[PDB]
C-alpha cells in the first residue's frame, strides 16, 4: 500500500531553567523508529523499533551529529522568533517542525512535506511544488525572505526526492514483516442499558494497524453522525490501535442499527449488529 516517513521536532524554551530542549522522533507510517532528546544524560539517537537496530555505527553517529547541530540551530530560531514578535525574554515558547515524504502503492514519490509552527500555530510551509513557501504572517515573511536568499527550498527538495525516499524504501524492506502488514480490527458490539427506554450500543475495533479506520453507526441505513460518540483512535501499546463508536438508541429498536467498519486490513467493509 501507501507509506510515509516523518520526522517531528519540538524545541521549547524555558527561561530560568537552562537552554531550550530539543526532541526529535522519526516515524514510518504509525511506527516510531528513532528518538533524540537533548535533555538525556548522554544525548544520542536511540532505536525505537527492532528493524532499525541493524543499522551500523555510522548511521547512529551521523544521526546524532545532525540532531546535536539541530539543538543549537533551534535555539537560534527561538531567539529569532522572540524578536520577530517583539516578545519578552520571560516567556516559554515552542517551535515545531514536521517533514518527510509520502510514497504511493508502487513505491513512487507522491509528495513531500516540510512545515513549521510557532506556539502551535502554522508559521511557514514548503509548498507542494517543493520550490516556494507559504508564510503565515509578517514575521514568517522574514524567515521566507531569508530562506529564499539562501535557496533553502532547493536543498529540501533534493532531500525529499532523494534521501527521504531512498531511506524510507529501505526501512520498508527491512521492516517488511510489520510495516507492510495490516492487522485488521477485531470487532464486536456491546449493549448497555441507560434507562427503561434507552440503551447504548457501542461498536468496538481492537488490535488494528495502521491507525486509519472508519467506524460508523447507521439507523435504517442512514449515517448517525450527529448522534454518534466517536472516541479518538488510541494506541494499545503493542503497536496496535483501538477505537469505539457509540449511539444511544430506543429500547427495542436495536436491530435498526448497524455499525460499519472500514480498514485497510479488511477485504471488504464490515457490517455488525448487536447480537444478544
Amino acid at each position: 500500500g501507501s507509506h510515509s516517513m516523518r520526522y517531528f521536532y519540538t524545541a521549547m524554551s524555558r527561561p530560568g531553567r537552562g537552554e531550550p530542549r530539543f526532541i526529535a522522533v522519526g516515524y514510518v507510517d504509525d511506527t516510531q523508529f528513532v528518538r533524540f532528546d537533548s535533555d538525556a544524560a548522554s544525548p544520542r539517537t536511540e532505536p525505537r523499533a527492532p528493524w532499525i537496530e541493524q543499522e551500523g555505527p555510522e548511521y547512529w553517529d551521523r544521526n546524532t551529529q545532525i540532531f546535536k547541530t539541530n539543538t543549537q540551530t533551534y535555539r537560534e530560531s527561538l531567539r529569532n522568533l522572540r524578536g520577530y514578535y517583539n516578545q519578552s525574554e520571560a516567556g516559554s515558547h515552542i517551535i515545531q517542525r514536521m517533514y518527510g515524504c509520502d510514497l504511493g502503492p508502487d513505491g513512487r514519490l507522491l509528495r513531500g512535506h516540510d512545515q513549521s509552527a510557532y506556539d502551535g500555530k502554522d508559521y511557514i510551509a514548503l509548498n507542494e511544488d517543493l520550490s516556494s513557501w507559504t508564510a503565515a504572517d509578517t514575521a514568517a515573511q522574514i524567515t521566507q525572505r531569508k530562506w529564499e536568499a539562501a535557496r533553502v527550498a532547493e536543498q529540501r527538495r533534493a532531500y525529499l526526492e532523494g534521501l527521504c525516499v531512498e531511506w524510507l524504501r529501505r526501512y520498508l524492506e527491512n521492516g517488511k514483516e510489520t510495516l507492510q502488514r495490516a492487522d485488521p480490527p477485531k470487532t464486536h458490539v456491546t449493549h448497555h442499558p441507560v434507562s427503561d427506554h434507552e440503551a447504548t450500543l457501542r461498536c468496538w475495533a481492537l488490535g488494528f494497524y495502521p491507525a486509519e479506520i472508519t467506524l460508523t453507526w447507521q439507523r435504517d441505513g442512514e449515517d448517525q453522525t450527529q448522534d454518534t460518540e466517536l472516541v479518538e483512535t488510541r494506541p494499545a501499546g503493542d503497536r496496535t490501535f483501538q477505537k469505539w463508536a457509540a449511539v444511544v438508541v430506543p429500547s427495542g429498536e436495536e436491530q435498526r442499527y448497524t455499525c460499519h467498519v472500514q480498514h485497510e486490513g479488511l477485504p471488504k467493509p464490515l457490517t455488525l449488529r448487536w447480537e444478544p
Partner: peptide, 8 residues
C-alpha cells in the same frame, strides 16, 4: 534518515 535544519 533525517535532513539538516537551518535557523528561522
Amino acid at each position: 534518515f533525517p535532513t539538516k535544519d537551518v535557523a528561522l
